[PDB]
């Protein structure tokens, strides 16, 4: 395989692979909908309040050593690259933007062909997002159980954009339903290397069979929702449905399990946090903030030490939080 | 009833009622999706190409006497008020912007309560769209058959915003399924006066009984799709499903029919045209432009003269295209 220039696109421009440092690979500054943050900022108090909250959070995460986060917010998660650039500069944390489509594509996207979609993903990666010149450094896709016809098109366009640019693909999955397998099937049918793909939300399930089967094939396993837990909130139906009833320690243990299985090179870890969240019930943000006051700092502050205690070597945790993300994000073309 | 200032909000600011003049009440500069025009302008060639096309089309309609158009593009139809302002100034045609929600609300909108929706509509009307200070002069809603639970919330929020601001409500209906009746019932249950409402796409039906009974209750009847016809495109399934097989003459005669039943004051006429269209199959804009090369000028150039030869008095046509839209758009509050 070959590289395209050894640089990773961030919202402040290209950085070298070494500059990425400690990287959280699945995060969000704001989980919203296309055009929403700009049409109704007051839903988050104000765009300023949101920016200010995000800067505090990024600064707290940075104090714990996070130097880079991958904001996997696609067009339909309401990604506002201008907001990302502003908070990245104010907090001095590298932010890698995404292209791709999540599970709320509007009609103008749902009626598109795979060829059309491939050109939109390529546009965001090569030309840049909107008119900002900010190029996407990752392609985000998703399935909530068996892929629907439109989602298959998205996965295929994702694989094509990745094969042409070298930018990796990262996925949302209904991990319990083993979505990662079908996703991998499609990706491979397009000729994409598994090393270019992270099967996300993999800690949303406890089947090590599933996870180790994927890692053996060469995929990156995204254990990205470690702090998500509604334990103690059984009285809240909406928060329970979203966060699940498994402990953060249960999720964290899958990281050690994969390490013991021998797949430390294939693990990517994250919080899947955000500072604003309009695509769910009102006030979900407050509920989650009570659940995990540490926000994106959760991984370094709670998870890394938990694993070290459970016996995982510090050398290994560095490999996971620094080396793996560096290899994943470096634009890499398949050998011609 | 009461006025709130006797001025109509346009994208270039307020205009007196007599400045509105000849007004097309249901049109679009671009029928898209939230954030789409800004994220993928190349889908329309370029933002600049799209804008030049709209200016040309607006100038042609202006040449025929059109002084104002109501762009009923909602947040989810991808309304880009900056684009409206730019072409309004360049073509020197007043454009009234809309708030409300059509049938592609994203998750951040679909999960909102009637109270929350009401605040968003009031925001766009009072404070302005996004951060532009451009205030909505009309509220757009829609159903396509029986109202879904979300759509009932949208209708009620629209009635509450209209009651508070005086701005009228205009609707998209599956006219042949008589949606007008359920919309009316919901609007009247909120205390909205029928005179603040236009039941749109009414010319999509041939059921004069249904139309007259609504007119009788004081509703305005939008015969806004006059040039929509796929006659001669019987081999084009997508175009046929969108435009129908009824001729423009058949649609237009509904204007005469309503006049004959004695409801000239209740009629509003339009083309429901656009210059960019991404929320449907690719290249649909090209098929429509071939169908109706006159575009928005179709009403003044073909329809007004046709009615004239069918015996409708010139003065009655002036009342419909000038007086009725003026009365409709004047923000009007219910009596204290
Ligand atoms: C390899 C030495 O770690 P590092 O380079 C990056 C790093 C910091 C904190 C944690 C929890 C993991 C990784 O130290 C910061 C300057
Ligand atoms: C008395 C009304 O005419 P009007 O004010 C507006 C008007 C112009 C053209 C058509 C087809 C209808 C109405 O004439 C333009 C200066
Ligand atoms: Co997800
Ligand atoms: Co996420
Ligand atoms: Co419509
Ligand atoms: Co329309
Ligand atoms: Na690039
Ligand atoms: Na107003």
Swiss-Prot record, chains A, B:
Pfam families: PTE (PF02126). Predicted to be exported by the Tat system. The position of the signal peptide cleavage has been experimentally proven. Zn(2+) 2 binds at residues 140, 172, 201. The keyword Membrane applies. Keywords: Cell membrane, Hydrolase, Membrane, Metal-binding, Plasmid, Signal, Zinc. It is an enzyme of class 3 (hydrolase). GO terms for biological process: catabolic process. This is Parathion hydrolase. It comes from Brevundimonas diminuta. The gene is opd.
